[PDB]
Symmetry: C2
Subunit: 364 residues, 2 copies
């Protein structure tokens, strides 16, 4: 990961920049920062500069509404974005790319759109404030903005096929909606794409939380920005979420019960311990390629108890199955609590989050 | 004829584009002697001259528009205009006044797409400028006399961002046209901006009732009829291919020949104009100056098949017998060029003068109304 930074030319967060946040925030850096889940960035300093100089900034993230079974991995950006929203108290804009799924998959426009509404339930279950978050459907919001399509057009002019052909790999057997889709993903990065929220303001920086594997796709947007008179969108990159069986039982869905969660991490997670304990008691603990532990890295909020689990699993004291039932006690209460929060999401709360509204934000 | 596209029209021949051949290549159908009567019977009106003199000579499924009009099932008219700049020419009047004619004789709603996004992409303009031209060009279009309770005129940049139905159709059409197909119709290249690669779906979209929920109450099946010069047909031949794939009725069409450029019937009157157009902004003096000096004569006698003045006469005189008398006469030698041009100047001068007058009457508030999404009158 330290070599993917140099590869994409991004800036690495320290344990010193993390402090800069704490000074304006007034909290304790989220464990993603503390642990390095979210390690890289691009222009966080620029966003920070305006936060103290008493100027707003906003967040943006999206979601590809392809059915659901949003697994626990998919929670990583949202958990972090939610945090960002609360410590800075700024607006967030969440995009549901229904057109995209329609273009790429065997769905009807309605089918893609219903998935967008449903996924929006799961997202709201994460707890986003309703007074500073706007979840929008591409298909819906294009028809309801006096600023969105215009920005999409500006981008479409300043980007050629050859450009989108290298970055995304589009060939020419593809449909045109695809070739031009990258402009729809980019448009949300610029404030005046949301008139009911921001107005015709253009000086509001945009912070985009996402992976590190994504930087090459967001550079297109960052490169077009100067060219159209708009500031670049800042970035905060994260690491990947270990695929369960190894880096259908392949992932752990938020719709999974409690026993399924139990039987998955027990029968399908990956082990680093010599596990087939010839005599794992002073060996075993490979906390780099052991999924169960990697997960605790994301979901167990206590550093002290985590380090204890690492010293102990690596040393050989803690066997496998012991570490596993430790994770289960973190997931089961994470997932089940998610499902409950999502039960309380009425058809009217969804419609609200998805309605072009004025928001309550920190101009500061 | 050789080349006819949405951006260029070229022929080696002074007689102009071979229209019976364009019909074979494009796959459209010739407007028969007997299809014209059906228009008469069905509308109880004499067919407009463009129909009688073969100016609008090609169609697609007009028999299906009539199939429905006869049975009391509506249909609507859709046509468009790319505002490349503020000034339009007299060739532009052909599709519009004919559309104004279809509107009255059939009494059906009409939508007119002002493609500001198309020109913002293809040309060097700001979004402000591109919208500006849409507004100005709408005044001239309005000057043709369209019923305000029966016509919707929209800028693409504005209507895309305010319609619960337009973008959705663009997206649907976009899924069914590959870059490969689009570069084999419009000749696009890997160097073109993405906005241009996908632009075709935006022109294809008004071809479906759905993009105007406010007009046809989310009805989805109202038959569409599109009047246009035959250089806009690649867009619509693409559209009719896509329509069934997204469960919509294919749009019908009526193609017109091109109003020749002054120098000859090799190109069409365009706004580039090295010096080839009579702008709807020209003074009586300029119109006369342009006809006498710039309009290719044929003549020196008289060959009607190449005289740019006589071609113009077949578009705006409106007296089949006089035109026919001007034909035999110019051919035989009796008429003698300066008289022929003198005649044409007597028709164009008032035509453009009445246009300007009515245009001066289009107040800002009227442009606004025509361009606001409305219900219309179930026309």
């Amino acid at each position: 990961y330290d070599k993917l930074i140099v590869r994409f030319g991004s800036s690495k967060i320290d344990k010193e920049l993390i402090n800069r946040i704490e000074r304006a925030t007034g909290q304790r850096p989220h464990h993603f920062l503390r642990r390095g889940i979210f390690f890289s960035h691009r222009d966080m300093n620029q966003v920070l500069d305006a936060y103290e100089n008493k100027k707003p900034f906003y967040l943006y993230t999206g979601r590809g509404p392809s059915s659901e079974a949003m697994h626990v991995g998919h929670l990583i950006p949202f958990i972090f974005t939610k945090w960002l929203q609360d410590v800075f108290n700024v607006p967030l804009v969440i995009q549901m790319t229904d057109d995209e799924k329609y273009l790429w998959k065997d769905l009807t426009l309605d089918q893609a759109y219903s998935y967008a509404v449903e996924n929006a339930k799961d997202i709201i279950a994460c707890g986003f404030d309703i007074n500073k978050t706007f979840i929008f459907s591409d298909l819906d919001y294009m028809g309801m903005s006096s600023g969105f399509y215009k920005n999409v057009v500006k981008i479409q002019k300043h980007v050629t096929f050859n450009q989108v052909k290298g970055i995304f790999g589009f060939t020419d057997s593809d449909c045109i909606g695809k070739i031009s889709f990258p402009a729809i993903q980019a448009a949300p990065s610029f404030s005046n794409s949301f008139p009911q929220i921001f107005r015709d303001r253009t000086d509001i920086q945009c912070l985009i939380p996402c992976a590190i594997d994504q930087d090459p796709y967001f550079r297109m947007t960052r490169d077009v920005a100067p060219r159209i008179g708009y500031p670049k969108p800042a970035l905060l990159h994260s690491t990947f979420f270990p695929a369960l069986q190894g880096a259908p039982n392949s992932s752990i869905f938020l719709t999974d019960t409690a026993k399924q969660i139990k039987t998955k991490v027990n029968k399908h997670a990956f082990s680093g311990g010599r596990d087939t304990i010839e005599e794992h008691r002073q060996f075993g603990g490979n906390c780099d390629v052991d999924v169960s532990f990697m997960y605790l890295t994301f979901f167990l909020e206590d550093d002290d108890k985590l380090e204890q689990i690492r010293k102990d699993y690596t040393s050989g004291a803690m066997l496998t199955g012991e570490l596993k039932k430790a994770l289960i006690e973190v997931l089961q209460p994470l997932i089940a609590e998610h499902q409950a929060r999502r039960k309380e999401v009425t058809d009217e709360i969804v419609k609200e989050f998805m309605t072009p509204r004025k928001l309550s934000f920190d101009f500061q």
